[model samples]
Target chain A: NPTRITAEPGKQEIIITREFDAPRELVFKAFTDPDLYTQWIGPRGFTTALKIFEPKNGGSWQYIQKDPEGNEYAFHGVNHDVTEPERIISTFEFEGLPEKGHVILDTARFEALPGDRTKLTSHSVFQTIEDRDGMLQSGMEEGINDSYERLDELLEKMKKLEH
Target chain B: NPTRITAEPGKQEIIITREFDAPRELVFKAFTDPDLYTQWIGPRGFTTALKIFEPKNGGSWQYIQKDPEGNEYAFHGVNHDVTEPERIISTFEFEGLPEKGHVILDTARFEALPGDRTKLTSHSVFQTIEDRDGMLQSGMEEGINDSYERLDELLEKMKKLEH
Candidate 1:
């Protein structure tokens, strides 16, 4: 399904919702597996590098992406609940800014739908409104939706590759 | 001038802006004063009690407002800058909640203008988007704007009463 982003006024939340044609198992695997994750994550022309990926509660992850001009953008956070086939709750922060401490409590829920489809919902809690708006203006939706498109193609190949 | 409340999506902020008819000094006085502040703060039917009202940078403040039925809603915060005539930055939290530590980095900037007016802008950064929404759903804007109207009439009296 098409990606959608929404946020309410007087609150700090960045929500992204999408649906994938693949099953929940495959979709979750594609996101959680380091090799599969690196394959489809980030937007086009931005090479993503995985620094850490530990799918465990209280674990940590760090991933960096380089744009076309080779500017480094990094994200890291402590993982909370990286449950299988269902949900992942973690903290995410962009370390590219001058100052640190602006972190987001991020959650991704994978709901298994009929016909081998999967619905993905992301809920993010920003520490401040300005920080939330900062990411909003940072073409975040462009990157996320673009990466989802990449995910859609990769999942397509994955579904047939299992045959 | 009237009270206006505005907020942006994907943000955790409750911004309250008001332009007062009186000059900045008196307006700031009415705001920072112990007696005058208790006089016109909170909604019309709510009675406020000040536990501590120290106007020092290292000091703290606590105030509780009780509804007509004697239900208490408490707010306490640690003062930071507390600079006179210009700005006051603090951390405000609602103690009536089940747990603690949901604080808002609150700020009030008073700008003096011509025609004996003062602009009051409140910028608050909530700890989470849900906390921001929780306050919004609690009829916060209604309580604030109502108290602001009360402040409006009180300032009329002060402008006439003062030197």
Candidate 2:
């Protein structure tokens, strides 16, 4: 399935829509289930270490990404709303850039497609236009593509396990 | 003297223009001279420490900003072109984002204004629109304002030192 990502600079938001060749429940699990999420949450060439993750409303999540050279980048966020197999809303922050006040509010919605496929739509909002541009500037598209590809692989693996 | 900052998103560049009350030579020196640069180069609440600074063309520069909690953020770059009291071209990178490849090429042109004043114009080019947007989002305008205000104070002190 092809993934589509679009940026609305004026609105300070990014929207990503992707279809998964799997059930909506399984696709949503890939995001909310910690063990499954850790499998494909980050971009290629980095490993994620979760410090805490709770997929409940008002629950917080934090994690660190370790590069090949052992350098670490930390990020944290809080879940504002969570509905199983349907939708989620969260706030995100990068610990390294505390001065920028670049917190982000993001929402993800999952819908069941024909033939048992799942459609996922994500909307990400930043504090300002600059913050949104900065996220785009950070080569996030590449990372997102890589992460989605990994998700594809993980989905296939889970399907095989189920059968 | 107020600083004016504008972003050309299509060109992936940011332009900054500011007029200093001092002479062109003194204003230029404030940028090239390490001791003077340190006094005003970073945003308020952060102290800058120079690790390496060679202002001439082909020279390299590196510095770390220590935050209130003693957390350090490192940045480094190389001077591609450096002409005294006139212009400078350089590359900039924030070490904290090593994986993103967020290097920026920056140019500054100094012009003489009336009454020994100096008009400084700076242009920054990024590799991608996202990078440029990211910079604007990072609350850089506030930092720029704070840094320039510090520069104004420093320039006044330098004039007193010379007299």
Candidate 3:
């Protein structure tokens, strides 16, 4: 899983792009289903519990993650667009931040590749440069790599079951 | 274009992966449409002429590239799979090579990225390590980048009209 994170100076966008040797439908579905979403979302020893999970256009969603010692962190967002095996546009906000309204627009897109492969990219646009930088400094790279690594495992199993 | 070529030791696959700030439909369609394809498919000093183009499953294709001096190079292949805005699997061979049977399997994948962006990756698996290395040493990197640079320009206009 070469989950590369990209950010350029003076830009409000940060993207994590990676490829998987699995069908986009299965891969995209994993992001939509709560059961599958929570399975590989957080780093090891952290469990995700959904407060609300409506994965559709204009749907509102929220989830909280509890660490091994029971420390909780939450995020909430609204889905602006959701197209299966294609794209998902949503607004993301960290609930633990000092202030609200520092919303980030997120786009998760899935592309179908040859040999039943899928390329997944998640693009996030912060309200400000500082917010985007803060996100980069928040140990997100490791967290995302960990989650996606687990997701790769989950997808392998799912694909096996599919056959 | 920012075309990145990747190949690892002992691997038979060489991949040129790039992202475009355009829709996958437009990006992929640019490859399918001969008129649009030839407009940006070769180096600046050369032009492409399609001898045969049938962009469909099991369809065969052949094309010739003529440089400023009128020197011609030909390539032909069979499309194994063709899915719009998604994937194309095909065979590729340079007709000018010394001998025949040195074909390459090419898979061009189009993935929908965020912000109306598209990720295109052409994965070529050669029959032998020599063939793969020969391809890398064949000035392909420059050709690919040059072609894609023109492709970006073409897509920009296509998208402007799309709106």
Q: Which candidate wins on DockQ?
A: 1
Q: What are the Cα lDDT values of the candidates? A: 0.79, 0.80, 0.80
**Interface RMSD values for all candidates:** 10.5, 16.9, 18.6
Clashes of 1: 3
Instruction: Give one digit per residue, the lDDT tens place, for model 3 in B9-97.
Output: 65555888999989899998899998898999978789888988978754668899998998999987666557797887666779899
Cα error of candidate 2 at position B84, Å? 46
lDDT by residue (tens digit), candidate 2, A60-146: 688999877888899876665577888876667787885633456567889999999999888776655688898989999889989
CAPRI grade of model 2: incorrect
Please report the TM-score between candidate 3 and the true structure: 0.50
Off by over 4 Å in 3: B1-163
Candidates in order: C-alpha RMSD to true structure: 10.3, 14.2, 15.4
Q: Which residue pairs clash within candidate 3? A: none
Instruction: State the TM-score of the second chain for every model.
Output: 0.95, 0.96, 0.96
Worst 10 residues of 1 chain A by lDDT: A99-108
Q: Write down the DockQ of candidate 1.
A: 0.05
**Residue A79, model 3: Cα distance from true site in angstroms:** 0.5
Query: Ranking by DockQ, best first?
Result: 1, 2, 3
Candidate 1 lDDT over residue span A1-163, tens digit each: 7898987665467788999999989999997889899888888889989888877654567899998997998987655557788887666768788964455666788999999899999887676657778888888888898889999999999999988
